[model samples]
Target: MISLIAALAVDRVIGMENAMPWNLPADLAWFKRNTLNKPVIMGRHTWESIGRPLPGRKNIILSSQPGTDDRVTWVKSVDEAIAACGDVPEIMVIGGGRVYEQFLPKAQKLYLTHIDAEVEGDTHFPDYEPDDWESVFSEFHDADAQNSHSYCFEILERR
Candidate 1:
């Protein structure tokens, strides 16, 4: 199964200048907890934004100009990345806008952190019809000194 993981603002803005707009350690922790030991497929820009391959997961990058690295698998397309995952039961599609949009139709689950506030951003999460999905779980977190804004961690599965 393909699952998409993202943290977006109320307006569905995901990034600013190619990076996440806020620092929420808890959200980062949540991501790591869920994706550890899984194959993570991302666009080339998202891989660059993260700087290096995440230590405990298989890093797969979708890129036209593929590169070699013992730490990562570079594929020319999303289908290639999915194929590279082999027998893994679930692959996480971590993203930039285009990648998320491309996989949205095929994704079986969505792990989204919805921030309560909005910031100016150039990248936005793709809109989806509410009727196409059903919320499976939700947890709210209040803003604190460590977190910039209140947020909800929501898991949605395709209907």
Candidate 2:
């Protein structure tokens, strides 16, 4: 399955200067649990922001320029990223902004975490019609010491 995962603020803001605007340990944990040990495709900047290869995961970086990293597979296009996954049954598109836009239409499943607060951001999540997808799973959590805002996790499968 090809899935796209992201955490967005109420206004759909996902990034502020190439980094998340909000810090939520719960949401981050959810991300790691789902993506660990899987093949994940992400944009170059997004990969850099993370700072290093994610342990136990195959990291594919989508970049136009040539690059090399022992722990990362650099590809120029979405098709290249898919090709690098080989026979894997699942591939994750995890990103900053542009990469998500490119893969959104092709994604079969969307793992979304919605943070219940509006915030300023330099980049925003791609817009899609709700009718195009149907929720397969849903969970909500109240804001607490570790999380700044109430959030909900929803898995939407294409209809």
Candidate 3:
């Protein structure tokens, strides 16, 4: 299965200045536990933001460039990322707006953390129709007054 995973804001905003705006430890833990040992795909910008390869997972960076490393396998397209995954049961399409847009149609599942606040951002998630997906699970978390943000974790599958 192809999966798209992201933590987005109310405005579908993903990042500004190449970094996530919020830090939620619980959400980070969830990602670490779930995506470990999987094939995680991302765009060049996302890969650069990470600065280095993520441990315990195969980091496949989609770029129109040629390169390879013990931690990263750079490919020219989204299809190439899928191809590099081989017989892996699933592939995780992680981050940057354009990369998500490229894989959204092919994705079978989505793991989204929806933040309640909005920020001025240059990058945004792709436009998706609600009719095309089924919400399988969701859990809301109220924001602490001091933090100024509320959020929810949602799991959606292609309808």
Candidate 4:
């Protein structure tokens, strides 16, 4: 199975200057809680944005550049990244805009943090039809000391 994880603002904005616009520690923690032990596939820009391989998960980078490391596997495409995952039951597609667009159609589930505020961003989440998926879970959070924005964590599965 393939799952996608993202946090987008009210306008579907995801990133500004290659990083998240808000400081939502709770959302970050939510991502870690769900994806910790899975195989994670992300595009090269997303990998660079993060700066290093995420700990406690197998990192697969979709890139044309040829390189390898103990912490990550470099593949040229999403198919190769999924292949690198071996027999893992679930693979998480972590993102930058283009990567998300490429995998969105194939994703079986989505773990989204929908921020209540809109912020300027060069990257945005791919548009999806609500009729195609059903919300399996949802939890709302208010802005607090550690998190700068109010948001809702929603889990959706294809119907």
Candidate 5:
């Protein structure tokens, strides 16, 4: 299934720059572990922010233009990303805002890190009506305990 995973602030601010603004180590570990050995689809901007291909995962970049390296499979649309994934059991949609909006309709599940605080950011996730999804699970973490920032990990499914 196609799943989206990201961390956002209370105001839905996702990032200040092209990359994730928060340094949440726990969230990073969770993302890496879950997406390892899977195909990860991301927008051109998101892919550029990472600088190079991530090992242990097949990286697909959704772009309107060609990328410089052969390490990334550049797809123009969400369908192309799915096709690139082929028979892979799980696909991770890692994003900048535009990429998330394009794939949200097909995503069956979401793995989100909701931060308790709010911050000014340049990008945000699109709004969905309240009835569109159901929260399946959530767990909050203490900032002081784990060398991590305060946040809640939420799993949601289409209702």
Candidate 6:
């Protein structure tokens, strides 16, 4: 069975490469455990987002490039990527929805994680969870009356 894995957050999704904009310690460990030693297929955007191949897993990149190393295998298309999976039943498909769309049709096993909380913006804000500071609100908005999209407010306070 072809498989896919993703960690998604509510109110937002995969950014450029669609790295979930929230922090959940558990999800990463789970991802590491599940994707371990498996072949993971990803688009160039996601691959570039990571900036390198994920260790311990066979990184099969779906792109048109003539470069590769001993650990990573670069492919030119979706067909070639799947064909490279080589009949492995549980190959791992990693990255954003665009990449997922290509493999989803043949996918039977989906490992998904949903994150709750606000990481709507980036720049270390999405990743500021160490020591678990309490989020306070000073100027908050509750919009989204169909005339305008919803607005949220949050303040980070050291707990």
Best by TM-score: 1
Instruction: Compose the digit string of candidate 2's lDDT tens values, residues 16-46.
Output: 8877767899998999999998999999999
Q: What is the Cα-based lDDT of residue 136 in candidate 3?
A: 99
Residue-by-residue lDDT tens digits, candidate 3, 1-159: 999999888789999999887777777877887799998999989998888988999989887867755557888876778999999888888878989999998999999998887778989999899899999999998877544578799999998
**CA lDDT for candidate 1:** 0.92
**Total clashing pairs for each candidate:** 0, 0, 0, 0, 0, 2
TM-score of each: 0.96, 0.96, 0.92, 0.96, 0.93, 0.67
Clashing residue pairs, candidate 4?
none
User: Candidate 1, residues 1-159: lDDT per residue as tens digits?
Assistant: 999999999689998888886899989999999899999989988888899889899999989994867689999988888999999999999998999999999999999999888689999999988899999999999999999789999999999
Q: Flag the better candidate by lDDT, 3 or 5.
A: 3
Tens-digit lDDT string for candidate 6 (1-159): 676677544543546324544444455677899889889998876777778779988889877777555568888888888888787757888855667877766665556554444455331112223354454443323333331223332333344
Please, what's the RMSD in Å of model 4? 1.1
**TM-score, candidate number 4:** 0.96
Off by over 4 Å in 5: 145-148
Clashes of 5: 0
The per-model lDDT (C-alpha) reads 0.92, 0.90, 0.86, 0.90, 0.85, 0.63
Q: Model 5: per-residue lDDT, tens digit, 1-159?
A: 999888888788888877666677788898898799999999888887889998999999988887678977888877888999999788999987998898889888888888866678899986756688899999988897563568898889988
lDDT of 4 by residue, 1-159 (tens): 999999999789999998875788888899999999999999988888899889999999988889756568899887888899999889999998999999999999999999988799999999999999999999998988888779999999999
The global Cα lDDT (0 to 1) of model 3 is: 0.86
Number of clashing residue pairs, candidate 6: 2
TM-score ranking from best candidate downward? 1, 2, 4, 5, 3, 6
For candidate 2, what is the lDDT? 0.90
